[PDB]
Structure formats: C-alpha cells, structure tokens
Amino acid sequence: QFKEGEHYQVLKTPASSSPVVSEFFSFYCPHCNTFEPIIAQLKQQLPEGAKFQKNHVSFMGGNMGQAMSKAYATMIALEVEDKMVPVMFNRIHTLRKPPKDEQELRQIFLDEGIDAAKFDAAYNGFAVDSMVRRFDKQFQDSGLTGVPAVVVNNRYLVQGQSAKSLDEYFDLVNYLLTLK
Numbered sequence: 190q191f192k193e194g195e196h197y198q199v200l201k202t203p204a205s206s207s208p209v210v211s212e213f214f215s216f217y218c219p220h221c222n223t224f225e226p227i228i229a230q231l232k233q234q235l236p237e238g239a240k241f242q243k244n245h246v247s248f249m250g251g252n253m254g255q256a257m258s259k260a261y262a263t264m265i266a267l268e269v270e271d272k273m274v275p276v277m278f279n280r281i282h283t284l285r286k287p288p289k290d291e292q293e294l295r296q297i298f299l300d301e302g303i304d305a306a307k308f309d310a311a312y313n314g315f316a317v318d319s320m321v322r323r324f325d326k327q328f329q330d331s332g333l334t335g336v337p338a339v340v341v342n343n344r345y346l347v348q349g350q351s352a353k354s355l356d357e358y359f360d361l362v363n364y365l366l367t368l369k
C-alpha cells in the first residue's frame with residue numbers, strides 16, 4: 190500500500206532504538222491547532238509499546254518563539270499537558286491574544302491553576318532547558334523544513350497529503366512504526 194517517495198520520505202538521521210512517533214509543532218501554527226484533535230486520536234490507537242513525543246519549534250512567534258518552546262517543555266515537566274496544550278492553542282487561535290512577553294506567558298499557566306513556585310522552578314530549570322535543546326537538535330538533524338511534521342522512528346517523514354481518510358493516515362503511521 191504505502192510507498193516511499195509517495196506516502197513518506199526517508200530522512201538522513203538514523204533509525205530510533207525503539208518505536209516512536211515524533212510530532213514537530215508550534216502553538217502559533219493554525220494547522221497544528223487543527224491537527225491537535227487528530228493527534229489525540231492517533232495516540233489512542235497507537236500499537237502497544239509505541240511512544241508518542243511532541244516537539245515544539247521556536248521559529249514562529251517572533252521574539253516569543255523560544256519562550257513558547259520553554260512553555261511547552263514546562264507542560265511536560267509539570268505533567269499538565271492535557272490541561273495546558275488545548276488552553277494555549279485556544280489562547281492563540283480562538284481568543285487571538287498571544288502572550289506579548291514572558292509575564293503574560295506565565296500568567297496563562299497561573300490562570301489555569303498552575304502553582305507559581307512550581308512553574309518558576311520548571312520554566313527556568315535544567316529539565317526544560319534540556320528538552321528545548323532536544324526539540325531543536327532533532328529538528329536540525331532531521332533536516333525538517335516546517336511544521337507540522339510527523340517523523341516515525343527518527344527516520345520516516347510522513348506525507349499526510351497522501352491519506353484519504355483519518356483511518357488511513359493512522360495505518361500509514363502504524364506501518365512506518367515497523368521499519369528500522
């Protein structure tokens with residue numbers, strides 16, 4: 190069914206050690222916003238033992254892009270992705286009130302009930318710094334040129350504009366998870 194060059198491209202990076210689906214996104218990206226409920230269904234139907242990893246990119250949002258990457262990494266660090274990922278998309282794309290500075294970015298978390306001391310320790314901490322650097326290294330090493338992008342096993346770039354239903358898009362990802 191699924192064919193190289195048509196349904197996916199092989200990237201220059203080496204294959205991952207264990208099965209993983211990696212999404213590269215930005216909270217500033219409208220298509221990433223549209224994609225988020227689709228991602229939520231992809232995750233629910235992934236084969237047992239396959240990991241899913243969202244990676245935020247810093248090149249949208251002007252001088253707030255890197256701060257927003259740290260914000261996403263903070264959602265991972267604090268284990269509040271289920272609450273904060275839809276909140277942040279909604280703030281930028283429905284309310285259309287993107288944060289003008291880091292104070293407003295922090296306030297978006299506080300206004301959802303995140304503890305201020307826990308946010309401050311995470312946002313400026315080593316785990317978040319390490320995760321943002323990893324977002325960036327993967328994006329650079331993979332030769333990615335934009336978002337959204339979905340990479341399977343560190344090496345197979347999905348061409349979503351090949352699927353003819355949501356179920357077929359899922360079949361393509363699941364097939365790629367079996368490649369080395």
Ligand SMILES: C[C@H](CCC(=O)NCCS(=O)(=O)O)[C@H]1CC[C@H]2[C@@H]3[C@H](O)C[C@@H]4C[C@H](O)CC[C@]4(C)[C@H]3C[C@H](O)[C@]12C
Pocket residue numbers: 220223224227337338339347348349350351352353354355358
């Ligand atoms: C779930 C698919 C991809 C989701 C997405 O947001 N793309 C980005 C992912 S990626 O970075 O390209 O991997 C989308 C992309 C193309 C979509 C199809 C096309 O839009 C064409 C039709 C449109 C109809 O309204 C619904 C069926 C459909 C046949 C769509 C089903 C589904 O929504 C598809 C298959």
